[PDB]
């Protein structure tokens, strides 16, 4: 019967919107039982199956719908979404373009096609496609919210104020009607939403994971309640898709190997395959046990594996990011599950017990922002492997083209040995600083930079052009290995002025909003001889920033843009700046550690979200409270004082250069120990028969 099958299909659509996916599947299947050749029911069934993580079964039903109805545009577009989730970009593209070819007015297909362009890095094409979708369907939350993020990425601030209003209005209407918000949980930190809204957005994304594991019908796991089976050792499992060349490994790759094997047994669960980098090698070698879960795509079997290892504390290092398999945590194969380091925000999910943070990053007065209980590290929860990855930057020398500490810089493992052969070198007290005069050697080095030569040899020592590291050693450029040569870094390499203050920020441009650039403009206006140093991250954002700066009274020559660089050059060239100006909307996190390792003072203004308070936490651990602003006026004043009072700048720069070593900020050994103390507090609390509570010491 036509009416019978139609009613079943349409009611199932209603159940789907209500969040009752199980009943939806049931009704779709009954529809197909009544009317086997029902194209709409095949396509609609495949959609809920997709939402349940049954991707291959979805594809089969999509193809069946299309066999029955060759011009079924909805089926093509929906199939594209499945192929995209399967990382089949070309297949997804072919489905979207076919759908658009069938129906050019198909708004959903345009918006879905836009997401491919967006994730490919083709932001202008994504923007154009999202605008086509909104032209066809003006009320379209997915298209509008993703378009807004596209505009954020390239710093397009056209009607930014009304954009923010619309975004907030959309999230409010979606949360009220119990829908999955169109704003991604990570992106929510960028918009003037309430903390309640941000946590609710996260919560609903965590609910997607529950939809995927509910169809497994797995019973709850029995959890260990003593350390007997592990000979008194606590079994900690680190779960990450980022064991490899990824900022996550650049921060914590030394941590598994530094755990005390008398009290801890380290399990690393990789969600990604081996990328062949030294980062992956190190973790595989230093972890007590390394498990490649990318070989076990079934979440039920993967969680079974974790449980069989007898993990006491499972650590989530992904949150809502690419490669995540939070279905593993939703299944609860471990009695204690904690968010750590990787994701700058709450999961919003019940299956996560703790978020490892600190008092500075996450004060108790903003604890409602998180769904997890707070677990405090004594200093900062943040860490970096800089001392291990870039020890060639521990010491430096300069060439006096006449004394500056950041115009022409040399670094190297054998730098001290090289300087021994140069008897005319002066040691200037600021650890102090060796200064090479304008001699034969210095002229040879400077000629190399001016002529774009790759490297030269002096007294047997290899002296490298800092721009040419990849041509000399690929592994050294990525941070996989320590550079062996003496490297030369100059302001001339990046078109930075020789006699002016350089304020820098090396973050992705999305972290900048109109209010931030305005604040930076106020600073530059008060420091006559000063420029702002930013990255083409991406390059298409550059003319936008320049325009808005000009409108704020800043000449175009006051802002200098450089390309993104390999990991090692990026950290190293931070030495050329005088001061880093941190982004208040969302701080530099990894990039914050990067700049401090270079010995460059960072000025910050902590907000309320976790992401906006990390830099202040780093600086507090470093021991430079004077670089933390309580408001915008103070942020500007601090930055201006550093740019105008040159003796104060010298003092602060010297303080950072010294304390990056002496403070616990880059001490991975101390970090691991304190992380261990925190793990034990978590365990004893649980072992005493208690539900998780704030471990705020």
């Amino acid at each position: 019967c036509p009416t019978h099958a139609d009613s079943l299909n349409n009611l199932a659509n209603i159940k789907r919107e209500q969040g009752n996916i199980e009943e939806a599947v049931r009704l779709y299947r009954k529809a197909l039982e009544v009317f086997p050749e029902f194209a709409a029911a095949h396509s609609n069934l495949a959609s809920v199956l997709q939402q349940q993580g049954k991707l291959q079964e979805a594809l089969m039903h999509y193809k069946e719908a299309i066999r029955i109805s060759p011009t079924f545009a909805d089926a093509y577009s929906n199939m594209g979404n499945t192929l995209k989730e399967m990382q089949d970009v070309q297949g997804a593209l072919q489905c979207y373009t076919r759908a658009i070819q069938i129906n050019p007015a198909f708004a959903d297909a345009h918006s879905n096609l836009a997401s491919i362009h967006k994730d490919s890095g083709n932001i202008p094409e994504a923007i154009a496609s999202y605008r086509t979708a909104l032209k066809l369907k003006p009320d379209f939350p997915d298209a509008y919210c993703n378009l807004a993020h596209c505009l954020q990425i390239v710093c397009d601030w056209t009607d930014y104020d009304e954009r923010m209003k619309k975004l907030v209005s959309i999230v409010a209407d979606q949360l009220e009607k119990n829908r999955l918000p169109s704003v991604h949980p990570h992106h929510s930190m960028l918009y003037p939403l309430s903390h309640g809204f941000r946590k609710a957005i996260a919560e609903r994304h965590g609910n997607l994971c529950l939809d995927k594991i509910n169809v497994l019908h797995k019973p709850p796991y029995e959890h260990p309640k003593d350390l007997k089976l592990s000979d008194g050792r606590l079994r900690v499992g680190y779960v990450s898709s980022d064991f490899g060349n990824h900022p996550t490994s650049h921060l914590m790759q030394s941590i598994p190997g530094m755990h005390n094997p008398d009290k801890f047994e380290v399990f690393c669960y990789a969600l990604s395959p081996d990328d062949g980098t030294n980062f992956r090698v190190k973790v595989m070698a230093e972890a007590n046990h390394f498990i490649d879960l990318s070989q076990i795509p079934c979440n039920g079997k993967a969680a079974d594996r974790i449980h069989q290892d007898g993990i006491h504390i499972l650590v989530n290092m992904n949150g809502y990011t690419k490669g995540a398999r939070n279905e593993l945590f939703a299944l609860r194969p471990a009695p204690i599950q904690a968010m750590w380091l990787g994701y700058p925000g709450t999961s919003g999910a019940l299956f996560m017990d703790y978020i490892i943070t600190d008092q500075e990053t996450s004060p108790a007065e903003v604890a409602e922002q998180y769904s997890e209980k707070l677990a405090y590290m004594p200093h900062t929860f943040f860490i970096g492997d800089h001392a291990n990855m870039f020890p060639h930057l521990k010491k430096k020398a300069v060439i006096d083209f006449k004394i500056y500490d950041n115009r022409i810089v040399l670094n190297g493992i054998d730098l001290k040995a090289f300087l021994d052969s140069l008897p005319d070198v002066k040691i200037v007290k600021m650890l102090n600083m060796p200064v090479i005069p304008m001699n034969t050697i210095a002229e040879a080095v400077i000629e190399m930079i001016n002529r774009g030569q790759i490297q030269i040899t002096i007294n047997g020592f290899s002296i490298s052009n800092g721009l040419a590291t990849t041509q000399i050693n690929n592994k050294a450029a990525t941070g996989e290995e320590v550079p062996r040569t003496i490297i030369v870094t100059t302001r001339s390499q990046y078109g930075l002025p020789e006699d002016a203050i350089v304020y820098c920020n090396f973050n992705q441009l999305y972290k900048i909003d109109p209010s931030t650039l305005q604040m930076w403009a106020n600073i530059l206006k008060r420091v006559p001889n000063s420029v702002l140093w930013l990255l083409r991250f991406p390059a298409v954002g550059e003319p936008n920033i320049q325009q808005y700066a000009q409108n704020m009274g800043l000449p175009q020559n006051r802002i200098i843009f450089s390309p993104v660089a390999p990991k090692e050059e990026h950290v190293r060239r931070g030495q050329l700046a005088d001061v880093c100006l941190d982004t208040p909307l969302c701080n530099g996190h990894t990039t914050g550690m990067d700049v401090l390792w270079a010995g460059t003072p960072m000025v910050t203004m902590p907000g309320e979200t976790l992401a906006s308070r990390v830099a202040a936490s780093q600086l507090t651990c470093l021991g430079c409270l004077e670089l933390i602003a309580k408001n915008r006026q103070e942020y500007e004043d601090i930055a201006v004082k550093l740019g105008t009072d040159l003796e104060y700048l010298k003092k602060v720069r010297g303080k950072v250069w010294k304390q990056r070593i002496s403070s616990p900020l880059f001490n991975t050994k101390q970090y691991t120990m304190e992380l261990e103390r925190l793990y034990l507090q978590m365990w004893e609390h649980y072992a005493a028969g208690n539900k998780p509570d704030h471990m705020i010491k």
């Binding site: 959609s47 997709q50 979404n81 879905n112 997401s115 379209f140 993703n146 991604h184 990570h186 990991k567």
Partner: peptide, 20 residues
Amino acid sequence: SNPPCQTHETGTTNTATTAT
């Protein structure tokens, strides 16, 4: 190369088809 960063996949929109 462009450096690896913290990345998020962009959500897509499924189309529900009503039967007539």
